[PDB]
Amino acid sequence: SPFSVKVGLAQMLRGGVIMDVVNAEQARIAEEAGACAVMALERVPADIRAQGGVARMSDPQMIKEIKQAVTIPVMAKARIGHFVEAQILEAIGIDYIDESEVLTLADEDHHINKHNFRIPFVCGCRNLGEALRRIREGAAMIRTKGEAGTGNIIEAVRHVRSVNGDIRVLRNMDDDEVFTFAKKLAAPYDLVMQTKQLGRLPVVQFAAGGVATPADAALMMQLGCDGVFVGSGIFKSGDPARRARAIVQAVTHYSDPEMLVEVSCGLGEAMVGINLN
Template sequence: MADDNAVTLYSNAAITDAKKNPFSIKVAMAQMLRGGAIVEVTSLDQAKIAESAGACCVIVSDPPRAGISRMPDPSLIKEIKQALSIPVMAKARVGHFVEAQILESIGVDYIDESEALAIADESHFINKHNFRVTFVCGCRDLGEALRRVREGAALIRTQGDLKGSGNVMETVRNVRKVMGEIRVLNNMEEMILHFQANSSTL
């Protein structure tokens, strides 16, 4: 882009043909984060500290403020992206595909469709198959995880306490629930598994 302070919303890079953007590449991008620490940052200084401390990726979020929580400032994301050698992730509101277009045009490596921000569309998540970038989504159970994967998410994280209290009880409960549901499916007979897959219980 000619102007570093400008963001092009509707360019050929924002929305791509899914055939040129295989899901396997997105999954490979997600695999790169396995076993590493992803650190949430709100400034360039924090991002540099995270990289020097050994983070495998930083996730840029908007500093806490009054009003509606939304995607971080694009100029901050570009500043961090230029200064770091590790992947950069940024948050977008659930269902807000324009925020996702902006983040993709900036060149982030991952987009977190985050329920921690204000929700733009509570009924419809972003169609992540329309994007070149890898998406991360949260879930509270296996059904939510599978729906996010069907929409194109390559990486699933378990949701925790959205109030920012630091209480991990809800996260632990959701992890146990997802893992328990996976164990149940693993032990099912094929015929029952087929019925379960076609039922509305997930």
């Protein structure tokens, strides 16, 4: 199936960090740090949060600048439900579209029918039900999301534990109870059973939301994620190039505290961020 081919392609991103970039300078810094891909958007989430205004797909000119700037995969964000923003991005010839809750929602009731596209999609989730609905709409990769643009890992941790926790519950569930589990998740039964049989999400699952330090990036990996997104934590810090590299190494070496010490040491000022509580 072409869906299973898209799911197959994203497997290459395991062990990696995907970095949000707003220009070609940010893209090249991300590639040099060892990012597995770049994510082109208008403004980083912390800026979107602070400034407000309507956040949309980036000008295609800018996306073309980022694409010619690097040889790693280039991803770009479209507003939820804005299938025309997605058609434009596809036609530009990038590698993934992230239908992203950080941009301004364009359709509160429906997401993009992602099966109508040739190129693979990333979607956000906060729980298993949401993940499975995005996958059924045709998302080839999942981003388990915390708080966007605060530098606070708390919600990312909550959502990763929730998704992974329901998968472990599901794994051992009495088959006869799975119909009601599916109902309760409002997720498609066949995808729930597929999740049960595999003992993991049927697609690549990354963490996002508030990853600010190498320690945060490694934590996500130890909680069972395949990789991480970093939106704000790199380009809102005092030394983006160094910090980018440290986070990449943290994800590569997530179970090595000696290395985690080394890459974390003398990194300069992290993004101050915001404590919402």
